[PDB]
Write a structure and sequence with these properties.
This is part of a larger assembly, with 3 copies of chain A. Chain A has 49 residues and is mainly α. In chain A, 29% of the residues lie in helices and 0% in strands.
């Protein structure tokens, strides 16, 4: 059952990046919410999507 | 510094119905809407007997008429769901909508739509439960049978 | 949590909202490498 040919595999690291909207939260009250630029758009819509 | 909160992933829970499970072959599932008025569903079975008689001196046991009757056993199911009065208020309370309330109103719509839908799962899963427990409470152990 | 309750008289559990927080345990990595000031010099030295 051990068979070695080759496996598709990632060659680059991922990217997490603080938004211009998100960086102020790190400055104002020292936190980062992931996709805080995207949670806000649900708030001016149906909230919990 | 951050706190770095990442994505609050929801547990989307799998939905089952009574007939979709495999127990449905053990049930003959019938809707009857005036059922609460009933007392004891009582299927009558008329059984003709097989007959054999023979010989000289052998006591011929006479022909037999058998009428057995089995009854129904009730077991109703009941789940509560608990919507807060504050969560019911935001359909009516409905403040300055921007920045504050459009979160809390539309989430209270979701919260009520969450629990009512989750309760429909419970009515099905409880129907999985008690129909199983009826099949437990009428099945003898195998060494008896 | 998957809501279910049952039967007659059986104590029915109210629905539960479970919210768990999972954290980050963090580790640094560091290697030193040494270049001597003769080997440093002969880069920029460029003799006759």
């Amino acid at each position: 059952s051990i068979r070695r040919t080759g496996v598709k595999t990632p060659a680059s690291y991922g990217k997490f990046v603080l938004s211009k909207e998100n960086a102020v939260t790190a400055i104002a009250h020292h936190a980062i919410m992931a996709d805080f630029s995207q949670h806000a758009d649900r708030i001016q819509q149906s909230s919990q999507k | 510094s951050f706190e770095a909160i990442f994505g609050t992933y929801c547990n989307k829970i799998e939905w089952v119905t009574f007939l979709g499970t495999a127990l449905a072959t053990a049930a003959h599932a019938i809707m009857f809407h005036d059922l609460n008025k009933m007392t004891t569903g009582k299927m009558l079975f008329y059984i003709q007997v097989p007959r054999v008689a023979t010989g000289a001196g052998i006591p011929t046991s006479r022909q037999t008429t058998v009428m057995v009757s089995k009854y129904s056993e009730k077991s109703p199911i009941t789940i509560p769901f608990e919507i807060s009065a504050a969560c019911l208020t935001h359909l009516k309370e409905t403040f300055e909508d921007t920045l504050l309330d459009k979160l809390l109103n539309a989430d209270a719509v979701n919260t009520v739509l969450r629990a009512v839908k989750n309760t429909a799962d419970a009515m099905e899963r409880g129907l999985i439960d008690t129909f199983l427990r009826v099949l437990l409470r009428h099945a003898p152990p195998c060494f008896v049978l």
